[PDB]
Amino acid sequence: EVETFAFQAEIAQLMSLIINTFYSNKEIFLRELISNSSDALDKIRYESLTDPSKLDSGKELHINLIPNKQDRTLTIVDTGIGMTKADLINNLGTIAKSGTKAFMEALQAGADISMIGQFGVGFYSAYLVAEKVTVITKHNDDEQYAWESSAGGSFTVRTDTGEPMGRGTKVILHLKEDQTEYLEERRIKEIVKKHSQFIGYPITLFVEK
Numbered sequence: 001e002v003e004t005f006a007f008q009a010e011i012a013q014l015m016s017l018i019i020n021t022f023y024s025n026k027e028i029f030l031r032e033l034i035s036n037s038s039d040a041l042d043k044i045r046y047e048s049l050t051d052p053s054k055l056d057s058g059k060e061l062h063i064n065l066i067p068n069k070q071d072r073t074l075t076i077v078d079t080g081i082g083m084t085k086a087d088l089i090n091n092l093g094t095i096a097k098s099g100t101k102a103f104m105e106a107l108q109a110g111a112d113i114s115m116i117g118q119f120g121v122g123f124y125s126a127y128l129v130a131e132k133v134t135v136i137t138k139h140n141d142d143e144q145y146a147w148e149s150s151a152g153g154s155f156t157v158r159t160d161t162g163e164p165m166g167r168g169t170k171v172i173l174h175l176k177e178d179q180t181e182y183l184e185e186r187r188i189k190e191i192v193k194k195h196s197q198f199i200g201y202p203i204t205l206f207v208e209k
């Protein structure tokens with residue numbers, strides 16, 4: 001049972017700009033997603049300071065990067081607070097309408113796409129490198145859900161019957177054919193070292209057979 005939703009017009013416009021603007025510095029997508037994971041981990045850590053049972057769904061707070069060259073996917077897994085179904089539908093827990101407004105004014109005034117995270121809509125930089133993004137998420141207060149979009153104005157949400165997660169979010173980037181450098185170990189290592197050196201959670205880059 002799959003529900004299909006239209007993006008708000010402003011978010012569709014943000015996505016189209018990310019997909020269609022010529023902009024070579026695409027590697028910042030990974031910095032933005034790791035930053036989102038770190039923010040999510042901070043939230044469950046803060047809740048656990050007064051309620052340790054918030055971590056009954058998993059005590060480890062970490063970020064895993066999982067490339068898969070056979071599936072042509074890069075997956076960013078974190079064990080942060082996760083998202084409810086309502087959060088997924090409401091632009092993955094962002095204030096993306098007002099963030100898009102500010103971002104596009106900043107671009108017109110001289111900013112570049114790499115500054116997207118300053119406007120709270122860094123998730124959508126995934127579409128720099130991905131033709132399709134799948135987000136699997138589990139929040140303590142809701143069931144496990146899968147969000148998916150290939151842009152084009154719509155996204156789907158469904159209950160996820162697959163691999164249970166415990167708690168957190170998994171962002172699965174189905175990479176564009178010409179963006180497979182981001183499955184290479186040395187390239188991912190370089191980006192993490194350049195842009196994510198002060199992320200306060202272990203980031204484990206998985207290797208492939």
Ligand SMILES: COc1nccc2cc[nH]c12
Binds near residue numbers: 161162163164
């Ligand atoms: C569809 O179900 C599943 N697919 C893959 C992995 C796992 C682990 C538990 N369930 C799984």
